[PDB]
C-alpha cells in the first residue's frame, strides 16, 4: 500500500515514534506496512501491532457505545430523524473496516507462518479479539458465525497455550482473560467466564514461585485484572 516504498526498519522506527506521540492511526498504518513486507514479526513488533490497532479500535468502540446509547434512548422520546442511526452506522462501518484489516493481516499471512507457541497464540488471540469486536456490533444473520469465529480462534489459542506455555506466561494469561470476557459479554455464558477466570488465576498463583521479580510483576498485573473481573461478576 502507501507504505510500500518505506523500509521495514523505518516503518518500525516510525511506529515507535507514533506511539510516543499518541498518533495511533499513524502507528497502525506503519505497522500494517511492516506486516506487508512479508517477514515474520518479532515479539516487540507483534506488540507494536497490537498496541496500534487496540488504540484505534478502542476509540471506535468507545464512540460506538456512546452513539448506540443515544440511539437506544431515542427509541424509548421525540423522533429526531435518521441522523443518530446514520452516524452510529458510519462509526460502525469504520470499526468493522479496522477489524477486517486486522483479520486480513492475520490471514495473509501472519498466522500461517507462526510456528512458535508465543507467536501463534498471540495471533490467534488477536483473531479472537477482533472477531469479538465485530460481535459487539453484530445484529444480522452472520452474528452467530462471527461469535463462532471468535470462539474458535480463542479455543485454538487456549489449546496451544495450555500445551506449550506455563500458566503464568503473560500471553496465556491475557488470552484467558479475554476469552473469559468473550464468555461473559458475547456468548451469554457468565458461569464459563467465572470458571475460566478462577482456574486461570489459581493456576497462575501456583506457578509464581518459579518466576523472577520482573516476570512476577508482569504476571501479577494480569492476575489482578482477572481478580477485578471476578469481583465484578461475583
Amino acid at each position: 500500500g502507501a507504505m510500500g516504498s518505506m523500509e521495514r526498519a523505518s516503518l518500525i522506527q516510525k511506529a515507535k515514534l507514533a506511539e510516543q506521540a499518541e498518533r495511533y492511526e499513524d502507528m497502525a498504518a506503519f505497522m500494517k506496512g511492516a506486516v506487508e513486507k512479508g517477514e515474520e514479526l518479532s515479539c516487540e513488533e507483534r506488540n507494536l501491532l497490537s498496541v496500534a490497532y487496540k488504540n484505534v479500535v478502542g476509540g471506535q468502540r468507545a464512540a460506538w457505545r456512546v452513539l448506540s446509547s443515544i440511539e437506544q434512548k431515542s427509541n424509548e422520546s421525540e423522533e429526531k430523524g435518521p441522523e443518530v442511526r446514520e452516524y452510529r452506522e458510519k462509526v460502525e462501518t469504520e470499526l468493522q473496516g479496522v477489524c477486517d484489516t486486522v483479520l486480513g493481516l492475520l490471514d495473509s499471512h501472519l498466522i500461517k507462518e507462526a510456528g512458535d507457541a508465543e507467536s501463534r497464540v498471540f495471533y490467534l488471540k488477536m483473531k479472537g479479539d477482533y472477531y469479538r469486536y465485530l460481535a459487539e456490533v453484530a445484529t444480522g444473520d452472520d452474528k452467530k458465525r462471527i461469535i463462532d469465529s471468535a470462539r474458535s480462534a480463542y479455543q485454538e489459542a487456549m489449546d496451544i497455550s495450555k500445551k506449550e506455555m506455563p500458566p503464568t506466561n503473560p500471553i496465556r494469561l491475557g488470552l484467558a482473560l479475554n476469552f473469559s470476557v468473550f464468555h461473559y459479554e458475547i456468548a451469554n455464558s457468565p458461569e464459563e467466564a467465572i470458571s475460566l477466570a478462577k482456574t486461570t488465576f489459581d493456576e497462575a498463583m501456583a506457578d509464581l514461585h518459579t518466576l523472577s521479580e520482573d516476570s512476577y510483576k508482569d504476571s501479577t498485573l494480569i492476575m489482578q485484572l482477572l481478580r477485578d473481573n471476578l469481583t465484578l461478576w461475583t
Binding site: 479475554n178 494480569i222 485484572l225 477485578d228
Partner: peptide
C-alpha cells in the same frame, strides 16, 4: 461497572 479485557 464494566469488566476489563487485557490492557
Amino acid at each position: 461497572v464494566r469488566c476489563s479485557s487485557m490492557s
